[PDB]
């Protein structure tokens, strides 16, 4: 039996940034839900449309796992119907989103003395994004009524900004590794489910 | 693309960079204050230089969004803070001269060294030395020698620099669209734009004088009592109807009358409440003190403190291996970081200082959600007010009885209440006239109502008339007595102490009324009261986002600073003083002088 590899997403050495998050599909395998209940300190295990205990055995078509890390007081925006910097310009979830969100502290792994400036998010955008839409553009955001021609200056700002995580930060500014799951059903026969 | 959106986006960037830069600077300063070394001082200096350069660059770039076309009243204050020119608007030579003058004055004050006229080398500085003489000595001549020497070998060297400093600061203030430096200083209390909560910069003087007028009778009675009890220690140096000499006030400048309790005690045979022995005989440490104060804060509804406080904060002297500055301060590094630096000992004074610093930390945690520029008190007299009101409740006998440091069968007599009230009055009521007089003199000098040749004359006339203190030796136009104080040699304000003293008792009275307390206000404990905690937290969370008038009304229900709650605090002491002063004279005569 080929078990669903729910062991590389939760145990990766490095995680992606908020503005460019990884998405690895899981299919053609029997799913388990015990290798996920470990790592006892879990900041949030909320689910929408499904129950955690009921999630033991259901048949679906494809499972998507998205990997990124934000600060402590931003997990609240990984929920449907939320507005903010991470919801508008980084990751939007639909109002009919079905799945669960898992968040846990990662201060030991993702913090360095002197700062960790390898994790970046988008600050300003000209508009918003539809659900499940990414944008890796690095153009200059124009805050005025003249074009900057691609160089920072007056009314010209660099969009991305580093987090600068440090081990001495508070619980709201500490890094928090977040994994979301989306369950979809198609006309194809259901195969991705365990015994 | 209106100006409002350009200001909004610019403020967002500025905040997101300022958090990181200020965190770096604060961490460097904290490391220096814990580790006194050369590498850490170099790192702190580098971080401070980077922060100052970034602040100057952003302030220069933020001047292009005029205030007249922005209507939100919350981005108004951020842009007002960022657009302050300060010394920047000046020629390079003038700014260099101003900085040189300030550095020279600070160095002269810090490296002040007077020498006794008997042997050339045993000279004493201010701290220690002269302070110990002026605090713990009863000799008339030694105190006079110290008082005159400090103002003759330090103040004489500050007047030529102070004149040029006044001229340059006045020119800068006028160039910054003000009328004088005093108005620039008063600008902190200014409120403009909000209907019904406005406060002109000129209204400050009127309110201060109006409050001092009602202060006057209690201070007169306390002055008479202190003079009556000071004639016993100095039989042939004080007139029964005259003014108090300036070198017998227990302090170098007469700022506080605290050191006079040994001579002006009402009932000497009855000791004050001291729980140091009970603290020692119950195996108490710094951790227990801070846990008890945290429990007291949780008792009123305020939350626990972060897990990071207990690990990253130092509460004891490291030892001889390390060197740290033993000064109790509350640190808000930002980004969820809260630390307290204190060399805690097993003492009641440290027990109350812990409550003070935790009140500071609670205030800092209250407005953590505000933008960076608004993360401060409502005005310059709000943080210390919270500290005092948080420390006042901890010294009540019932609070000490509830936590086990007082015997359950300890009856409180009304004599100890009088002793405690006199102790409080010697340090709270005896400083308001001094602060008011100093600030009024500085304001009038900045305005120009006092010409350069009448500085000392006006200063001593005001001290004789308002405070009730007379110089022991005549002073001509070469001395600069105001410059001898730390807050004048170094550029700092002084009205904040008066304003905070008047706010703290308003806050205490409001909270005690909200706690359904019955009896005198000086016997009030706000423990086990959620209503007082909510009432305080309603104002604590605003920060600078609202005018201080609204913040004050959110707690006390009054639109303006008052003096009635303070007089209610000292009502039993006032009645006792009136009874004891029936055979004496209340008031003073300006004419009498010790050298007359
Ligand atoms: C603050 O209150 C606590 C708890 O007291 C309880 O709650 C009150 C609202 C009131 O209803 C009391 O009657 C309750 O007992 C006090 O802690 C108690 O103190 C008494 C001393 O008489 C002691 O016998 C209890 O064991 C304590 N309970 C504990 C520690 O859980 C505390 O003393 C009060 N603080 C004051 C009055 O300053
Ligand atoms: C701070 O100083 C700068 C100049 O150093 C001021 O900018 C000038 O202000 C005057 C005032 O009318 C204008 O005429 C100029 O056009 C401005 N620019 C320059 C380059 O001179 C600035 O206004 C000052 N800040 C405040 C709040 O007054
Ligand atoms: C996660 O990674 C750590 C680091 O090697 C490892 O010790 C742990 O066993 C891993 N857990 C799982 C469930 O893979
Ligand atoms: C800084 O303090 C720590 C321990 O508190 C230790 O590394 C050392 O005493 C100090 N560092 C240096 C470089 O002196
Ligand atoms: C002021 O700006 C803030 C920040 O966007 C906004 O939330 C608020 O609504 C503005 N004030 C008014 C009255 O719209
Ligand atoms: C504060 O901490 C104590 C002990 O750690 C705990 O009993 C109490 O519930 C905490 N208060 C809150 C509001 O979490
Ligand atoms: C204290 O109470 C006693 C008892 O009535 C009373 O005689 C006395 O006047 C009161 N005041 C003082 C200052 O002792
Ligand atoms: Zn304080």
Numbering used by the authors:
A (entry chain B): 333 to 527
B (entry chain A): 19 to 614
Q: What did the study's authors say about this model?
A:
Receptor binding and immune escape have been recognized as two major drivers for the evolution of receptor-binding domain (RBD) of the viral spike (S) protein, which is responsible for receptor recognition. Receptor binding is a key step for SARS-CoV-2 infection. In this study, we evaluated the binding properties of BF.7, BQ.1, BQ.1.1, XBB and XBB.1.5 RBDs to human ACE2 (hACE2) and determined the cryo-EM structures of hACE2 in complex with BF.7, BQ.1, BQ.1.1, XBB and XBB.1.5 RBDs, respectively. As previously reported, the binding interface of SARS-CoV-2 RBD in complex with ACE2 was divided into two patches.
The phylogenetic analysis showed that BF.7 could evolve from BA.5 and gained an extra R346T substitution. The R346 site is a mutation hotspot, and previous studies showed that it plays pivotal roles in immune escape and receptor binding. Notably, BF.7, XBB and XBB.1.5 have a higher entry efficiency than BA.5 sub-variant, which was previously the dominant strain worldwide. BQ.1 (KD = 19.07 ± 4.08 nM), BQ.1.1 (KD = 14.70 ± 0.37 nM) and BF.7 (KD = 13.37 ± 0.29 nM) S proteins to hACE2 are comparable to that of BA.4/5 (KD = 14.37 ± 0.41 nM). Based on the ACE2/RBD structures of these sub-variants and a comparison with the known complex structures, we found that R346T substitution in the RBD enhanced ACE2 binding upon an interaction with the residue R493, but not Q493, via a mechanism involving long-range conformation changes. From the structures, we found that it is R493 but not Q493 that is regulated by R346T substitution through long-range conformation alterations. The residues participating in H-bonds and salt bridges contacts in the RBD of the five complex structures are all conserved as expected. In all the five cryo-EM complex structures, hACE2 H34 possesses two structural conformations. The H-bonds and salt bridges interaction network in patch 2 of all these five cryo-EM complex structures are extremely similar. Though the side chain of V486 is shorter than that of F486, V486 is also a hydrophobic amino acid that can interact with the hydrophobic amino acids, L79 and M82, in the hACE2 through van der Waals force (VDW).
